[PDB]
């Protein structure tokens, strides 16, 4: 694969073959144990989802050793959680310090004392949501350097080695394996990292004065094709919809919090078109 | 020793005493009539019945007597600008109810009081209420757990406990759990809590409280309007009594000048004491119009023209040049460079030579410490910003005349 520069400047049998691919990838596991014994780490860079392959390697091979599975595709994990887990849940030595490099020095000092206690860790999506900074990769490269800690990891993004320098690439003693499955990304995309009906549903929950205020805003929006606060205030005080200014301001605050009115300093624009708003207006006749 | 002193202070077993005077305090016979009018005009001396606060007194008294004789609990919100007889009327109502409950005219009750502006955090309210229940100081989580065990569970015979909450707006934080817990316990049937909250702003339930808190707070509000010209004369003429020390026009001018600014009663009761202290030094026994006008000039003071008259020569040249630079370049926020250029022009006009900018920065710092101008740190010399804090006509009134 050699990319060209010009494009930048001018701008069933499938299941049986997938199970055959998975069995041919499951034939690699004692070779992976012999590679992991000699100081290397394992990196997978295929196309499909490699969650089931690492789960099968954990189940069928490492069913007795210490294992720290790290879901790197989780959108709200931290380095403090992983380091506190290694400090307090494996070593039973209290919470790790708040500065993470001192925690890595602590983990190195407590792992130097205990040989033949091999800790495995299986990072699904080493380039995940909260692992894309350089500090997390520096901490992971300091953790993978220890002769007891062994590392398996997955890679999914295309710009992943842009944040590994030669120090982080000589610390990570990687062995690049091509485990290209064809399974879809069903676990990595279900998290938080990846209208009219809501308007009708919220509008069916408001009271009658909120209905009158929102219909006044809708009528002004469909007449002038954003309204200031004083015109809405006079149009609501003429029809006895509000008592004072703070009642209308609380109604508009509830409108901003339920995402039906957009206020910009104080003009009030409903972020929809005229056709859906016209059919919404004739829906209440 | 620390240990037994802390264990006897936290348990509430030693009296928190204060030292006594060696010389015994003075007598009432040794005080003159001007001294008697000076001690009777103090803000600390609350009368046994408040003039011009009768309608609100009957309102709070009817509300609290109904809530005590019904044994049901509830909530009230009174509000008003500071100095208009809120806390005095509420504690007068509570003293009247306690005297009625002593004579077996009313069912008995307990009276708890907290103030939000003497608490370090709002959760210490839980430490204080419990301290008015038992006497023992605990942590706030244990006091909150014990208050929730006390109020939510039924235990006859439970006595009604009226809780007064002064300065409610300090108990409001980002989470608003303390005010929610205080306004939530009357809504239970086993807790006979009648909470009356006092605040300054009239729109406190709509401005910063959440929806459930302003729903629980109720709609039986009360507003203390400020004192007018006529009531603020009646207050002082009821304070002074039948003495002829204050003339009528003196009290009339004091009430007219105070009731046109704010409507505070503390302002009038301090201006009258200052007028008494002025008339003490003139070797007279009556307070005429002149001492009242002098006290009105001294208490309501405006000394940003005398401060410009009492500056040095180069600081007056500096103020003239800041005013001229504001006049020239239109916008008020000036830079020190154009100010120093107009300084050099004005100093070339008047003939006196000006110091270099190493001393003009000292002049600008001296005017900024005196708050005649508003200037930055002097670390960015010749590029610091200057606002004129005094009015541009005050300089022309202070230097021409």
């Amino acid at each position: 694969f050699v990319p060209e520069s010009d494009g930048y400047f001018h701008s069933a049998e499938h299941e049986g073959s997938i199970n055959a691919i998975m069995e041919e990838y499951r034939s690699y596991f004692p070779k992976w144990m012999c590679i992991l014994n000699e100081g290397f780490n394992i990196l997978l860079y295929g196309l499909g989802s490699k969650h089931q392959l690492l789960q099968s390697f954990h189940r069928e091979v490492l069913h007795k050793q210490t294992v720290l599975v790290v879901n790197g595709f989780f959108p709200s994990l931290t380095i403090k959680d992983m380091l506190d887990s290694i400090t307090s849940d494996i070593l039973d030595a209290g919470i790790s310090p708040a500065n993470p490099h001192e925690a890595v020095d602590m983990i190195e000092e407590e792992f130097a004392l205990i040989p033949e206690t091999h800790l495995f860790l299986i990072v699904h999506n080493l380039d995940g949501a909260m692992l894309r900074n350089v500090k997390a990769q520096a901490i992971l490269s300091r953790l993978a350097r220890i002769p007891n800690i062994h590392l398996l990891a997955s890679i999914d993004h295309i710009n992943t080695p842009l944040l590994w320098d030669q120090g982080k690439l000589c610390s990570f003693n990687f062995s690049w394996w091509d485990c290209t499955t064809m399974l879809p990304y069903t676990n990595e995309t279900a998290f938080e990292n990846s209208a009219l009906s809501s308007m009708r549903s919220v509008f069916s929950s408001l009271t009658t004065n909120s209905r009158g205020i929102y219909m006044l805003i809708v009528k002004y929006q469909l007449k002038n094709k954003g309204m200031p606060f004083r015109d809405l205030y006079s149009s609501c005080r003429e029809a006895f919809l509000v008592s004072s200014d703070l009642a209308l301001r609380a109604q508009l605050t509830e409108f901003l919090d339920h995402k039906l009115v957009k206020s910009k300093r104080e003009q009030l624009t409903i972020p929809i078109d005229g056709a859906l708003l016209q059919q919404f207006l004739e829906e209440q006749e | 020793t620390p240990s037994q002193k802390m264990k006897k202070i936290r348990a509430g077993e030693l009296s928190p005493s204060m030292q006594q005077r060696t010389d015994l305090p003075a007598k009432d016979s040794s005080k003159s009539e001007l001294q008697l009018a000076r001690e009777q005009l103090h803000v600390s001396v609350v009368p046994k019945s408040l003039p011009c606060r009768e309608r609100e007194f009957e309102n709070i008294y009817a509300f609290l007597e109904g809530k005590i004789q019904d044994q049901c609990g509830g909530c009230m919100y009174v509000s008003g600008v500071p100095g208009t007889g809120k806390t005095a009327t509420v504690t007068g109502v509570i003293r009247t109810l306690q005297r009625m409950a002593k004579q077996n005219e009313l069912p008995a009750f307990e009276y708890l009081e907290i103030n939000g502006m003497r608490l370090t955090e709002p959760r210490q309210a839980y430490v204080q209420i419990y301290k008015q229940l038992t006497g023992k100081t605990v942590s706030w989580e244990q006091a909150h757990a014990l208050l929730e065990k006390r109020f939510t569970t039924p235990a006859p015979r439970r006595v009604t406990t009226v809780l007064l909450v002064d300065e409610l707006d300090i108990l409001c934080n980002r989470r608003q759990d303390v005010v929610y817990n205080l306004l939530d316990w009357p809504t239970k049937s086993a807790a006979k809590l009648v909470v009356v909250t006092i605040a300054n702003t009239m729109d406190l339930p709509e401005r910063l409280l959440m929806g459930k808190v302003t729903s629980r707070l109720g709609l039986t509000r009360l507003t203390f309007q400020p004192y007018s010209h006529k009531q603020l004369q009646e207050i002082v003429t009821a304070r002074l009594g039948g003495s002829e020390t204050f003339k009528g026009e003196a009290v009339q001018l004091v009430a007219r000048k105070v009731a046109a600014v704010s409507g505070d009663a503390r302002r009038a009761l301090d201006i009258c004491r200052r007028a008494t202290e002025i008339a003490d030094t003139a070797a007279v026994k009556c307070v005429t119009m002149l001492h009242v006008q002098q006290a009105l000039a001294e208490m309501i003071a405006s000394a940003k023209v005398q401060a410009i008259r009492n500056c040095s020569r180069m600081e007056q040249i500096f103020l003239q040049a800041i005013a001229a630079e504001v006049t020239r370049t239109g916008v008020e926020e000036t830079t020190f460079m154009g100010v120093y250029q107009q300084v050099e022009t004005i100093a070339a006009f008047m003939g006196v030579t000006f110091p270099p900018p190493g001393r003009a920065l000292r002049l600008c710092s001296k005017l900024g410490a005196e708050r005649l101008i508003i200037s930055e740190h002097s670390r960015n010399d010749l590029f610091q910003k200057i606002l004129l804090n005094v009015s541009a006509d005050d300089i022309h009134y202070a230097l021409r005349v």
């Binding site: 144990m33 789960q55 849940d89 494996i90 | -």
Partner: protein
């Protein structure tokens, strides 16, 4: 989807007797592992020297 993947935890501990060679007797007694270890120790000591 799986009971291993959750919506709260990010890390999962499988600690088995942790306190404070991966291959067993099958591979170490085989001759190719001993000759590989001997040759690698020789070459590593030579490059270190």
């Amino acid at each position: 989807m799986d009971p291993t993947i959750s919506v709260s935890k990010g890390c999962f501990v499988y600690k088995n007797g942790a306190t404070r060679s991966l291959l067993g007797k099958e591979v170490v007694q085989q001759p190719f592992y001993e000759e590989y270890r001997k040759a690698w120790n020789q070459i590593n000591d030579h490059i270190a020297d």
